[PDB]
Nucleic acid binder design. Sequence first.
RNA 1: AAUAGGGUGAAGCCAGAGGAAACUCUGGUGGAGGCUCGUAGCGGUUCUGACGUGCAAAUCGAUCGUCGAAUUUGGGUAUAGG
RNA 2: UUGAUUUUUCAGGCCAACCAUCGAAAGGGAAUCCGGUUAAAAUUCCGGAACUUGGAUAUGGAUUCUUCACGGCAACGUAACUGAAUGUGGAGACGUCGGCGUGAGCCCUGGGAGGAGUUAUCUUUUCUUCUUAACAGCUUAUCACCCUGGAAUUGGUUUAUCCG
RNA 3: UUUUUACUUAUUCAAUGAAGCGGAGCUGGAGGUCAAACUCCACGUUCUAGCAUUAAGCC
Lengths: 249, 77, 96, 91, 52
Amino acid sequence: GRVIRNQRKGAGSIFTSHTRLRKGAAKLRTLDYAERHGYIRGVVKQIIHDPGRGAPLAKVAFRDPYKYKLREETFIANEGVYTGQFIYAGKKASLNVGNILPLGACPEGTIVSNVEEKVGDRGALGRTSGNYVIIIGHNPDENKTRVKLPSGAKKIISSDARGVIGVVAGGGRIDKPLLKAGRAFHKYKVKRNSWPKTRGVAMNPVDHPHGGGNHQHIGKASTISRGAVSGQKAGLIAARRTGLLRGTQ
Amino acid sequence: AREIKDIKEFVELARRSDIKSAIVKVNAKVNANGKKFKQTKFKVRGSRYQYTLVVNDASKAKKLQQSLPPTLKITNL
Amino acid sequence: NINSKLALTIKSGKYTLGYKSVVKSLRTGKAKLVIIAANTPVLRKSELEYYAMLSKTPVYYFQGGNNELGTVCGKLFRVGTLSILDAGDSDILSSI
Amino acid sequence: TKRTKKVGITGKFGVRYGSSLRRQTKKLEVQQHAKYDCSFCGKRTVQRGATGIWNCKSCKKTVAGGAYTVSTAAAATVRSTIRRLRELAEA
Amino acid sequence: YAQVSKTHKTVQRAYGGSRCANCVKERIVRAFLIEEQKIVKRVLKEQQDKEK
RNA sequence: AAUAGGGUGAAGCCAGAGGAAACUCUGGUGGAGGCUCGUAGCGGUUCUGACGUGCAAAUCGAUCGUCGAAUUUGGGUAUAGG
RNA sequence: UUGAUUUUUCAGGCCAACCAUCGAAAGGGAAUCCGGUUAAAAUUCCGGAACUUGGAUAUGGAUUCUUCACGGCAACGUAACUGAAUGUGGAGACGUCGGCGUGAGCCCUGGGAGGAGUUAUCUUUUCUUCUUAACAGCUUAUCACCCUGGAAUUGGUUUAUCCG
RNA sequence: UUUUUACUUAUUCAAUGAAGCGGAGCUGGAGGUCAAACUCCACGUUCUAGCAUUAAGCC
Ligand SMILES: [Zn+2]
């Protein structure tokens, strides 16, 4: 047969992300002396739309502690953050929406976003619109914090990892139907080349494991082993179960 | 091209060291609220600009013409 | 309760509504009290209370916004700040 | 007069996409085109830019909000939750 | 702008050709009021550094 | 970079009428839409027309689809034979 | 980058985020127009009139004895009217559609001064020339802003209901 | 020999214009002090869309 559409994406010729209009990478500040020992104050200059992103971004200006210079940061805007607001980041920052605090400095039940998986990676968890991270508890002896991720998973993170207080702005986006193929076209025009999708069952046997037949049908189980190889992993990969989800999981 | 309005400024300008030549142009105009009068334009060619002085008085033109430096080449049009 | 006291002053006493009138009344020493709405910008607020400090005038911080401050005064518009020139039948100055 | 009995703003879609999808669109699209009261200046001049961006024409304050409303219910809950937990920590 | 006189490119005020009149006015008032409160917060702090 | 001229008439807004209220009705205004008739354009339904040693190794004619967007298109650029 | 040194030596003062290079005759971008001219070239030649950039450089004006100018309440004005390192901003620099407004060119048209056509009859008639470049000065605008004043009997106001 | 967990220098991951790490000591706030000051915490920035650069001062 032929190389299937799954495998052509790794080469990344026409499958790279369309990034001309993007407004910068959304990251926290580099963890420095001020954030480790006290707090540093910045001011929100802009709240802007980032193409390909549901969450708006905030442009926050900080002073450089060591040279006469202004540093502009690109944060993910939490809902309620406004232009001209003062943003405080550090160990001694107060528990206000938009402030960046270490996870150990936040009491249980604190809603936090753009949380660091590892100390200083500048934000990994809960970055999309309407999403957040809940702080479950602390383990001060081991310097660890328990959090709940938007997927429902419980994670143990260093208490020195940082997060931004509040919920990511732009939530409720999925509640409205797109209603049109053109709307999805414009949605993916600034994301990547993944739309529209032809069904593999509608192809020929060269194109896909599902192609061929005198009727459109998969022919074999569409649940594929985790240990299958590239060109085989088309369908439900390592599916623990199938069918309509009934009851609680 | 720049227009000069002050007659005193024009004579001081015509004796600048870079002034090559001068042009005296006579236009037979009419103010439409009267009858024919003879307009005179004095044009001084400097390095960068040509300077024009419009003299609507037929007598002040003749007095001004003899007030220019005698060294200037004058073309009558 | 202060809303009732303030309403009486508007009915019987003397007042100015608006930032420009309030600052003039502080300059002239004709202000007995300055009332500032809750959503007034802090820079304008911190300047009005600097004028009152120089003018030796008490300041009352209204708990509602300029929409609620306007309707207490019987107005169909917004009042960000006001000054009481003459508390009349009311006793708002003795309570603040 | 009243021009449409029930479609309202979704009358631009004609007969397409299904009635259930159009009435679901109508609820959130009335909200995203509404004018909201500014919490800063007090005027009703707040309108959406892109999703999550709500600008006031008068005082030129931009606030981060929801996709189709200035504030979602989840954000309002977090505001009070953060406010409550802040009081205990600071006594 | 390189080939025009300076009066065309500026206004005789602080931040003349850079900021508008109202934004300069707000900077001046903010600078004065905030720095005045900095003194107040200092003398008050010294009041609690000798009795408490 | 390009895309005549019409039809329909969505929100919003103005006025009038009715009602105790919750609200309803009428006349305008407005100018929405992967709306519609229809040029340029893009396409290529039917005649199973012409031609079928052609004007043409795919064209010609009439008829037709669509025609403000998932539109059409120049140039630059990327992807290379299991 | 300076003060230099004529001692053709130097003395230092700042910096070192990023920064090889290539990539657009439709993107960005310093500056030119008119008239004429050839068998065949012209925003290129000729005539005239400008402009930009780089460099050199004197005179006038301006400024200083209150050393680095004055005026205006203000928006701001002007012939000028110190300003290193470093920093902050602006311009470059930005989709699409709808109606409205203004301008320009074109279309239409009156008088007058010319030329041509029709004219058995009719036609104060039909056609045609009557133009003004870049550039310089003065003046000229929606929007925006300033001063005054303190508004419900709410007023102003767009084709489109927004503003206080 | 097998299981577990201690070390860091091999090896691996990440960041930064390699800027403040580790330990100790100055200063306060505390424990109730039963020798004698040991232990713990902190140790210049939070109404505001301003400013912070090329050290003043003392010896
Ligand atoms: Zn506002």
